[PDB]
Amino acid sequence: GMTILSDVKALGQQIWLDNLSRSLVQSGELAQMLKQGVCGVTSNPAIFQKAFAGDALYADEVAALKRQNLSPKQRYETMAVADVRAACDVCLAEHESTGGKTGFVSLEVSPELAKDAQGTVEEARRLHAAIARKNAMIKVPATDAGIDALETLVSDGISVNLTLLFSRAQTLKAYAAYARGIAKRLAAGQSVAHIQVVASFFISRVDSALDATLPDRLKGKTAIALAKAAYQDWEQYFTAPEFAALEAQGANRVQLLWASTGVKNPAYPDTLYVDSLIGVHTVNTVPDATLKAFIDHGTAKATLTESADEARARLAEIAALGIDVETLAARLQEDGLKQFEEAFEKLLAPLV
């Protein structure tokens, strides 16, 4: 039942909606969700491509914007920024109630900037200013350039959702960049207590890549094992003396956010990823249908840290089979960027 969302909050995990559209906000639905336990919203170019194509409330907005001398990208941005600002307003009471720890809405920079650190910083600063809300996160792919940009953006006081993480090594690099940005601000006497960063670590895509060629005992297990190990890494990094010295001064830990948590293989229960990844100081962003399924027949239990030994043994067998999860992660990130760019080009074409 619906109270499962509150039960998960009590276990220390926020559940965000991995969807955004003009009607979601305008209908009052998002406001009702933010009372029923949903704690935030994520978007990406594919989410906007589908929303722009299917939501009737965009038609008049597009017709209005086609009367102006604007590029397709600025037409898209005007639409998307408006949706994000409206969603931020709906989530503000939640955000403020926790001291700025919840109630975020994420907007991703253009995929074509993913390997351009300076361009990413420039666009992220601009979109942060354009949205003009304290509870907006700018979403930045965790390429090497994105981690460079993360350090700068954090030092600028901007909250960031670092996305397309599939690698424990790259995630640790992100934590180090975050800490450098925080340390810069503290050295300069600037505030840090309102800077929030999430590390969006993707789940289903790992199993989709590997399952058809894995042995029985491993099918449907790798993505969860990888996430469990990532969370163990998180505990070790953020409790270490180095970060404790920053947290003592008001720094917030980065939080892991489980993304791509809709189940894509009908051989697995539809709540598999949500049920299996609940732990303290995390987020799970879920598509509508997965949110539905979890409310109907999900289970709220602190599963993320259970059986970490088995997760390690599974990852050791993955390596024994010759699957290099770091090579895989780089490919999956590359593939995700290609897919997001494809979606972005698809949504721009009707805005010409």
Residue numbers in the entry: 0 to 351
Question: What did the publication describing this PDB structure actually write?
Answer:
In the redox-sensitive enzyme transaldolase from Neisseria gonorrhoeae, the side chains of neighboring residues Lys 8 and Cys 38 at the protein surface form an NOS cross-link under oxidizing conditions that leads to a loss of enzymatic activity through ‘structural crosstalk’ with the active site. Under reducing conditions, the cross-link is disengaged, and enzymatic activity is restored. In the previously reported redox-sensitive transaldolase, the NOS bridge functions as an allosteric switch that changes the structure of the protein, including that of the active site, and thereby regulates enzymatic activity.
Next, we tested the impact of resolution and X-ray dose in X-ray crystallographic experiments on the traceability of covalent NOS bridges in protein structures. In the transaldolase protein crystals we analyzed, the NOS bridge exhibits almost full occupancy, and our system may therefore be regarded as a best-case scenario (also considering the low B-factors). Photochemistry during data collection is unlikely to cause NOS bridge formation artificially; to the contrary, NOS bridges decompose while interacting with high-energy radiation but only at doses far higher than commonly used for data collection.
